[PDB]
Design a binder for this molecule. Structure first.
Ligand SMILES: Cn1c(=O)oc2cc(S(N)(=O)=O)ccc21
Length: 209
């Protein structure tokens, strides 16, 4: 059972701007997604401070980076708080409408796309390098869901029947044909060292056969 939704007009405009603007510094997508994962891990850690049972779905707080050259996917996995179905539909738990408004005013006033994260809509920087993005997520208060969009004004949400995750979020980037450098081990390490050196959770870069 697959539900198809239209993006709010402002969010469709944001993804069009990300996809169509000439902007060479695409590597910041990874910083933005890792920062999102850190934020989600902060949230479940804070909740566990007064209620330890919130970690019954998994005690480890970490971030894994999983490149797959056969599938041409880069997957960012975290064991953070996750998102409910309502969160997914409401722009993946962001205030994307007012964030897009502020971001686009900043762009016409000196800013560049690399500062997208200061406006709370850094997730959509995934479309700098991905033709399609799948988000698998599991929140303690809801079931496991899959969100997916190839932009173009719509996204889908369905119940996920894949591997159960316990708790957290998995962002699967289906990379553009000319963006496969972000599957290379040395390129990912360089980006993590450059932009994510002070993230307070272990980041594990998986290797391939
Ligand atoms: C293939 N794959 C995937 O799609 O998500 C994964 C998560 C893990 S984890 N973080 O549990 O080691 C390991 C492998 C995968």
């Amino acid at each position: 059972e697959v539900e198809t939704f239209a993006f709010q007009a402002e969010i469709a405009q944001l993804m069009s701007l990300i996809i169509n603007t000439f902007y060479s510094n695409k590597e910041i997508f990874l910083r933005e997604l890792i920062s999102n994962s850190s934020d989600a891990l902060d949230k479940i850690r804070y909740e566990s401070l007064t209620d330890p049972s919130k970690l019954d779905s998994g005690k480890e707080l970490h971030i894994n980076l999983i490149p797959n050259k056969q599938d041409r996917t880069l997957t960012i996995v975290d064991t953070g708080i996750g998102m409910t179905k309502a969160d997914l539909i409401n722009n993946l738990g962001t205030i994307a409408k007012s964030g897009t408004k502020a971001f686009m005013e900043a762009l016409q006033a000196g800013a560049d796309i690399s500062m997208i994260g200061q406006f709370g809509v850094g997730f959509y920087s995934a479309y700098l390098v991905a033709e399609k993005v799948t988000v698998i997520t599991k929140h303690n208060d809801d079931e496991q869901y899959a969100w997916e969009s190839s932009a173009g004004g719509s996204f889908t949400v369905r119940t996920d029947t894949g591997e159960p995750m316990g708790r957290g979020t998995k962002v699967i980037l289906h990379l553009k044909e000319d963006q496969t450098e972000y599957l290379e081990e040395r390129r990912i390490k360089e980006i993590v060292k450059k932009h994510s050196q002070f993230i307070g959770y272990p980041i594990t870069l998986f290797v391939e056969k």
